Design a protein around this nucleic acid. Structure first.
Ligand SMILES: CN[C@@H]1[C@@H](O)[C@@H](O[C@@H]2[C@@H](O)[C@H](O[C@H]3O[C@H]([C@@H](C)O)[C@@H](O)[C@H](O)[C@H]3N)[C@@H](N)C[C@H]2N)OC[C@]1(C)O
Ligand SMILES: CN[C@@H]1[C@@H](O)[C@@H](O[C@@H]2[C@@H](O)[C@H](O[C@H]3O[C@H]([C@@H](C)O)[C@@H](O)[C@H](O)[C@H]3N)[C@@H](N)C[C@H]2N)OC[C@]1(C)O
Ligand SMILES: [Zn+2]
Lengths: 71, 119, 86, 50
RNA sequence: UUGGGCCCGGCUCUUGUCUAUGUUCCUUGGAACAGGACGUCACAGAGGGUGAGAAUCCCGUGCGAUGAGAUGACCCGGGUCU
RNA sequence: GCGAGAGACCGAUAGCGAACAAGUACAGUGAUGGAAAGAUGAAAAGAACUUUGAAAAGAGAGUGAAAAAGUACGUGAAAUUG
RNA sequence: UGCUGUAAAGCUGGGUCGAACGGCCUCUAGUGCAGAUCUUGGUGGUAGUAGCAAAUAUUCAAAUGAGAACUUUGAAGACUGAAGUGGGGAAAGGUUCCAUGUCAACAGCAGUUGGACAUGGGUUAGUCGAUCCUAAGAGAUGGGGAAGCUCCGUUUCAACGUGCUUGAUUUUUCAGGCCAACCAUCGAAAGGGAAUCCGGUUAAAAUUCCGGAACUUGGAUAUGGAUUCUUCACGGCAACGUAACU
RNA sequence: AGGAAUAGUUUUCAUGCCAAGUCGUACUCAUAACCGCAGCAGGUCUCCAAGGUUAACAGCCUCUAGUUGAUAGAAUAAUGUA
RNA sequence: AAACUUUCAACAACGGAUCUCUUGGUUCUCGCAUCGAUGAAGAACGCAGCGAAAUGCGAUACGUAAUAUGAAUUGCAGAUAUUCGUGAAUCAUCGAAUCUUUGAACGCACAUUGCGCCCUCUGGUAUUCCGGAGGGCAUGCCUGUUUGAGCGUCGU
């Protein structure tokens, strides 16, 4: 996930299993003030949902991840 | 410990919902630190603080509706007494005490006397 | 060839999971659970199978509501709140 | 199969979760009786029956 | 011969608080709750716990005392206005 | 079903199938079928340390009233075996 | 170790052991085992025995390691021989995938190896499927049976639209005009069906990610073009042509 | 039905703008990942298909790709199996 | 004579009998009447600082409120947690709440996390198109309301 943060401008989150892509995009806009280029989702083999959120070129995923606090 | 319930009941709807926002933001920050510390007992405190704020909001709003419907003939079914299904089908006190005038005259005319023996 | 060779041709399920009892007794073609009788309104049971009644009866689950009727009955089906002792 | 339904995959995830050995700190508790997980399942020995 | 609405009681139900007298000496033992000596309480020598058979170490047991809250057209002892 | 008190009852192959994470593990497409399994010690004090060995372990040591109690643990018969 | 009794049995010396138990007078019973191809559990001889022989076949050296016939690398010798011992999938399984560590049990020899064991990681779609359609068929509904669980009927003896389009009105009201033969619903990961390709990328994902280049459907809507004084375009004998062209 | 003259169209002509939800997606598909109690010579649907010989997608040899897996050693009586 | 076999004794094995217990079972008696559309019983899936189960609980998830009480919890860790106190722990008590996906199970459907419609608010230049939040739309029957149908029928 951190390789994708570095090398694809993409942020990786665990999300609620009931959420769709529209809600995830709205949530990241409301929580972190970023524009998602797209949201790709995935249900992991442990039953939890993973979202691949690529930001637009107007944002830097590494800087957002630093501000969030996990890098 | 966390937030105190008696202090929450002094706050208004806007103060309660803004304190809710602060607590959820603080829980989200703790889950980020969870990825590295990785044992945070503090998460338990913040979780139960949210439950208390959510409880106080819901009970504050439930009393507004109860005061709104006070004395109304028809009130929402989750504000009605919930004893059992059979007890709610039972005749009311007024309905069970109804008496025909024929029966009422008989009861008045011949009441059960109070008496003793040997005198 | 009715034994081992024929046993190799078992890859089509007659039953799948039942939404009501969760048991893998829902017959696919009949659309009926051989265990609880779903989607019939009443639960399947028989007096010639008492041990089957043991497996799935009141008290084998959570009793999330009946658990507290006896305590509520004792207190006269109170309405209101407890009053602080001064 | 690769083509599977949501309900099946949900059942599969739970079965993976329960297929773990006992956490070690359990055995240290006061009056503890469990020494191992008696409900282990291996994919080739016992089938899930779903 | 006279109806009903109300207030305090009783009774009925739930529930709080409170209680006697050895842990004295010797011997065995890792441990005394064992044995021996001298006792104490007992309307309490039921039962359990505590490092071995414990009335007297702890909880209880027995005996009562004293509060609180419900509920009853369809239980009664009194007031009460009509 | 809910709350209690009892017995010339059974005492872990007995007593309910189940005294234990028992209607569990497991079997059957399915209806259904359905076990085994209680006890170190008062207290883990569950054996520091040295030494031989790749290790498991062994030998010293140690704890304990007891190791003829070492989580293959109360006692530990017979068949069978050195 | 002995003693008593014809006997069923009783008592005692020594060893082991750790919490209860016995004599006498009576009461009571789920009261005495060698057998039941008895029941459950345990254990022998057989016996280090039968056996571990289908599918052409292995060898040298190095590395690792306590330990190498069996792991890895190199060098050979072979085989499957494209109707494969190759490369993918459907059903079924469900993490077996990958990396790291690890060898008590399992891999009927072995084990440093493994689909084993332990800890982590991993499955990204408007365009691939499902989802939709109907097939054989299944099945609600006014109903008709049946004591009833329910059975029968679906072209179903029924007053069966949670209709549609306008001229607009916003007054969230109107007003008309068209109709209602058919249509509850379920039934295909091989039938029918809107639309995506190439190159690159991971330890493990890719027609899904990255780079570039497209396409479909739904919606909004601006610009240009086209059309109109012969109002709703011209040309070709024709087959027909076109950027449009109620 | 609605449309002309100093003017209505139509997004079935070109260009431009916005959006496309949910679930599946790893891996095996078999002389060890499925079913036969098992890593069982059994069973289990289908796609791709090189050179030589040849009528031939048969048999025999080979390239790409993949394996070298099936306890092993020493001998070579009888009786077997092929 | 050894080996081997057999008998006995001692110690060591194998195995789990015996003995002693027992938060279990079994039977008898006594008292009580309280499930559900106000959504039960049951099912699925989740929830803990570190959990697989059992126990508990439901996105407020080994629990929230309230009342009582009065210093723990404990395997380890830990406070922006507490001690003459609105205060540790407490299914102690319990009257207020929360209560996922379901289930008689109720918009339709269900081997699908499939498909509508209505109302309010809200994002995208929007009465239609796309998104989000909240609230709704089952069947049989009863009483009533309103809107109707039939030369069944009265009168004008
Ligand atoms: C270590 N193995 C475990 C273990 O828990 C085992 O326990 C037995 C235990 O039951 C025995 O203890 C026994 O004690 C008496 C008496 C006959 O001994 C029995 O009646 C009783 O059932 C049993 N508790 C004990 N002597 C040996 C352990 N291995 O029981 C189950 C097991 C899987 O075999
Ligand atoms: C004596 N009473 C009769 C009553 O029995 C009934 O008649 C039915 C008639 O309706 C049926 O006929 C009806 O139903 C059939 C259906 C069964 O397929 C339809 O196909 C047909 O079109 C329809 N007319 C006829 N087939 C039988 C009569 N007894 O209806 C007519 C009636 C006069 O009331
Ligand atoms: Zn069922």
């Amino acid at each position: 996930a951190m390789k994708k943060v570095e090398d694809g401008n993409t942020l990786v989150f665990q999300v609620d299993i009931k959420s769709n892509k529209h809600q995830i995009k709205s949530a990241v806009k409301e929580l972190y003030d970023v524009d998602a280029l797209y949201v790709n989702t995935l249900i992991r083999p442990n039953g939890t949902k993973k979202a691949y959120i690529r930001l637009t070129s107007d944002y830097d995923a590494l800087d957002i991840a630093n501000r969030i606090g996990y890098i | 410990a966390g937030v105190k319930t008696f202090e929450l009941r002094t706050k208004s709807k806007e103060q309660l919902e803004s304190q809710l926002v602060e607590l959820k933001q603080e829980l989200a920050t703790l889950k980020v630190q969870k990825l590295q510390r990785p044992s945070l007992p503090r998460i338990h405190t913040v979780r139960k603080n949210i439950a208390r704020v959510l409880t106080v909001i819901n009970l504050n709003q439930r009393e507004n509706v109860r005061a709104f419907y006070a004395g109304k003939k028809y009130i929402p079914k989750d504000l009605r007494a919930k004893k059992t299904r059979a007890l709610r089908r039972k005749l009311t006190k007024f309905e069970a005490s109804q008496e025909t005038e024929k029966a009422r005259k008989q009861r008045i005319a011949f009441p059960q006397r109070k008496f003793a023996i040997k005198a | 060839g009715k034994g081992t060779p024929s046993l190799g041709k078992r890859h089509n399920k007659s039953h799948t999971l039942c939404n009501r009892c969760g048991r893998r007794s829902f017959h696919v073609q009949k659309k009926t659970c051989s265990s609880c009788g779903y989607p019939a309104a009443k639960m399947r049971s028989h007096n010639w199978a008492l041990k089957a009644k043991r497996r799935r009866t009141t008290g084998t689950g959570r009793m999330a509501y009946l658990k507290h009727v006896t305590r509520r009955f004792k207190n006269g089906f109170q309405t209101g709140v407890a009053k602080a002792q001064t | 199969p690769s083509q599977k339904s949501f309900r099946t995959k949900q059942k599969l995830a739970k079965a993976q979760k329960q297929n773990r050995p006992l956490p070690q700190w359990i055995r240290l508790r006061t009056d503890n009786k469990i020494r191992y997980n008696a409900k282990r399942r291996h994919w080739r020995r016992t089938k899930l029956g779903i």
